[PDB]
Symmetry: C2
Subunit: 556 residues, 2 copies
């Protein structure tokens, strides 16, 4: 594998082996008064600042230099340019990778197979805006002449997680927009409980699927269309209540959707990088087009930062490199994303797809297997909730867990003269301070003594009160979570994931690993019909199917 | 540490080292036709069956025997009896651990400090039921004489995650109940966006806090009380709209809550094991008391299973032991919980607290540090959504991830003559079959050739289509997700966590690891007031505070 053969990677690993025991955050801070100044970056976007403070990490200047040299040795910059230039870097599928074109507000030509994609990107944006205006203003009427009050996006994975995460995060910007609902699971609970709350006369369904063949989505769409037709009783009414977001014109037509109701995207838009395309239509309907354009513009700002900033001061690059250090040197399996913002409650779940489906890979560009770790397991919940759920293990378990803590300085709801937000900030700051500093045996002993504990009681309780600390974090603090800032932050992590994938020599843009399960489910589906025992698989699959058939009947 | 000194643990580790490379799931199945029969358990609760199929695990009969011998050697059974008998097994806090008493429908006496706790458990249950009847029937009126239409639980961690997870899971059973809302984050967004949707005349607030001093909860409660009083303008009206769930009578009174409006629980109810107590009041209000009693009864059934079944056929014990094998022998950091049920969308998040706050520990009963792994990082999302988010990494990444797949045979919404559920089941079955079987180079080559790929194209794409498989899973399938069955399933995992904690020699029932962050946040809170630069902490904490103060002013 390329990474393990790289001499800069070998140098980094040898240094880690030689100097690991010497890395202690407390000591690093007392030895360098300028530690925060030297291991942080501030990004001024002109619409808010982003402080990326990576100083509470187990790194020195020498480590950061070696990591930057690794990025250079692995050709990160040339790979980056291939992406932005429309070269077919998704080599297993023979596709370009151009989510950056979707938000290219500068409109510089970006060629795919010699043809600039910008005119079509902009044509779809204009179509989205025109449709959005009609719907939001009440000009677009349902089959009985009423305005649309509810928009239901039907889609799964990349056709669901982005729009849901962004509409949740930008809820304060939804004045005057219809309610939005996201139906994604094939589990019939999802569509059933949603339809029960809706009036077909005032509901608009958005069928979101890159291929337009995804089983869960098409089945959900058909269920919705049947429910709609039970009320409307006229196939022509479908054109007032169903639109499609897809790359497949043919399948959209076959489904019965009016061709003028199709909002197109392209093969070079990966689903987990698709919210910036037509897939973002539910975002624009909920928060308006100006806000959607601000979201794209924030991403564009970050794209320019990533593309033109020297590596040593390039935010996505440094976040990526710190991750390489923890993954490939320290061996940490996971990466926690902990936004101290309830509106961002689905941010970690979004990056679970963005990061894990991109970099949970093991075949390199040369077709050989990696002999080192690749993408981490990403997880998290918003602060402060997580403090009361799982931080016990982060502070006093046996796992090393790099965490990114994120927060806006300004809240959307400064209630009680800002008291809630002041407490939120204090916890955000205290948690990373605590993770770094810990509390020694003697510090804890002093506290217990001052609290009046007896010798016998102190001796028994004391060991449990000790915190080893030395647990590294990034703190990412930004002025306010506006549409623009959210766009910049999401693009920042997109690019972090890109850089890690290039260093690992894997393809961040395909997803061949989902195929086998789809294949096997198609074989099992028909076997579930009827009372007959199934014997065609391994004994477990057979046993489970037979139990399912036995219990289908039970009355409980 | 006790575990590493245990001879059965040493024997298990040596066998693992000697025979690891020989463990292959495909081969284990073709060598044992009775493999499913011999590595599965069926539980018949009289209100549904639970099939625990652990046959797709990297174990043989010898491994299971050794694991059971380890449970015996570590004294799991005697520890279990100490828990059920009310002994103070939470040794660091000097408390009993009696969530099992909360649902002890058999009413056998359970003593704490010599006194049976059952009369008080039942007195509170009766008080909950009486209050619930008044509220749900409309007999309990708000300050203007209207019936209550909305119940808002204010609480965090153990006072939030259980009731929210259970009301979400049991949504079909909420006919005739008021709407329920959960406010938990201190982030002012949470309470602000909730209050904006409510009428003070018809809203009942439940302040849920074991100590009644948790900063987030009390601040949220005060904000709610202020909003309420702005409308009601009479402190006496608070008694019609605010109740408390707590152990602290004194603090409840000081807050201004009528003493008859306090639903008590006890020090031996851990927050992450509290939904079965007074903390479950919002559950009972939403789904009714009969359903809440069925939930407790399901838990009671599982408690009796755990307490009286020989270890080798005891479901929580075997789930625990398989976890010990993957954690302490294979070194897997994480454990994924993947319910194929949208109603269970917050189940994995609930067990993130239940498991990680219990067993994310490193000090043993002897006060010495563990020299082995303890609790895993728990994570997950419901199927099939997760297939389209992160399963790429489970199938083709570089991490070994034990997964529990769960599903009900019968759906609450059998729409389209059961089509959605049939597809859901087919995916549930196919995914674990795929994780086990994989797909070899030659199998993938055959497929590509049959699809008409040219030699050059096949050669390049082929390696990316290979699945190594051998990825172990548990499949837990139950008749239907009713209140009773949900109670049995939650108790099953409570007991799994108990068994793991005893094997590791840690205290599953305290949480000293949350203290340091609380301490440090209290110091930082006042420092955030005013324009002055802060220099009292490490350079990072100072730098972050100073950036926050600089940006507080920015207009974006």
């Amino acid at each position: 594998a390329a990474l393990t053969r790289d001499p800069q990677f070998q140098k980094l690993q040898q240094w880690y082996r030689e100097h690991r025991s010497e890395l202690n955050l407390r000591r690093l801070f007392d030895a360098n008064k300028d530690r925060f100044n030297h291991f942080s970056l501030t990004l001024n976007t002109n619409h808010g600042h982003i402080l990326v403070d990576y100083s509470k990490n187990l790194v020195t200047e020498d480590v950061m230099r070696m990591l930057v040299d690794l990025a250079k040795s692995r050709g990160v910059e040339a790979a980056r340019e291939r992406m932005f230039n429309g070269e077919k870097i998704n080599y297993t599928e023979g596709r370009a990778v151009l989510h950056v074109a979707l938000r290219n507000r500068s409109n510089t030509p970006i060629l795919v197979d010699g043809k600039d994609v910008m005119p079509e990107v902009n044509k779809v944006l204009d179509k989205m805006k025109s449709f959005c205006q009609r719907v939001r203003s009440g000009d677009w009427k349902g089959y009985t002449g009423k305005t649309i009050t509810d928009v239901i996006n039907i889609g799964i994975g990349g056709s669901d997680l982005g729009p849901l995460m962004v509409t949740e995060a930008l809820k304060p910007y939804s004045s005057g927009g219809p309610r939005v609902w996201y139906v994604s699971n094939i589990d019939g609970t999802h569509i059933a409980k949603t339809l029960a709350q809706l009036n077909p006369e005032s509901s608009l369904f958005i069928i979101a699927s890159k291929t337009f063949t995804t089983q869960e989505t098409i089945t959900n769409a058909e269920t919705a269309k049947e429910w709609f037709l039970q009320a409307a009783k006229d196939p022509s009414a479908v054109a007032k209540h169903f639109v499609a977001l897809s790359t497949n014109t043919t399948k959209v037509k076959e489904f019965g959707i009016d061709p003028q109701n199709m909002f197109e995207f392209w093969d070079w838009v990966g689903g987990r990088y698709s919210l910036w395309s037509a897939i973002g239509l539910s975002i624009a309907l909920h928060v308006g087009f100006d806000n959607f354009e601000q979201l794209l513009s924030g991403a564009h700002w970050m794209d320019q930062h990533f593309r033109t900033t020297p590596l040593e001061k390039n935010a996505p690059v440094l976040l990526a490199l710190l991750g390489i250090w923890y993954i490939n040197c320290f061996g940490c399996e996971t990466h926690a994303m902990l936004p101290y913002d309830q509106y961002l409650h689905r941010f970690a779940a979004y990056f679970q797809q963005g990061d894990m489906e991109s970099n949970g890979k093991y075949i390199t560009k040369s077709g050989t297997r990696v002999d080192h770790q690749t993408g981490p397991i990403v997880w998290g919940e918003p602060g402060t909730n997580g403090q009361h759920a799982f931080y016990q293990l982060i502070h006093q378990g046996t796992k090393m867990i790099p965490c990114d803590f994120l927060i806006p300085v300004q809240t959307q709801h400064p209630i009680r003269k800002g008291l809630h937000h002041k407490i939120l900030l204090a916890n955000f700051l205290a948690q990373t301070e605590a993770l770094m500093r810990g509390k020694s045996t003697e510090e804890a002993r002093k506290e217990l003594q001052a609290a009046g504990k007896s010798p016998e009681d102190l001796e028994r309780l004391l060991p449990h009160k000790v915190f080893e600390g030395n647990r590294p974090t990034n703190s990412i603090v930004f002025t306010k979570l506006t549409p623009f800032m959210l766009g910049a932050l999401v693009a920042m992590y997109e690019h972090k994931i890109f850089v890690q994938g290039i260093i690992w020599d894997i393809n961040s843009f395909d997803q061949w690993g989902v195929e086998l399960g789809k294949q096997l489910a198609k074989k099992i589906e028909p076997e579930l019909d009827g009372s007959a025992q199934v014997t065609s698989h391994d004994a477990s699959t057979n046993g489970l199917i037979n139990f399912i058939k036995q219990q289908r009947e039970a009355r409980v």
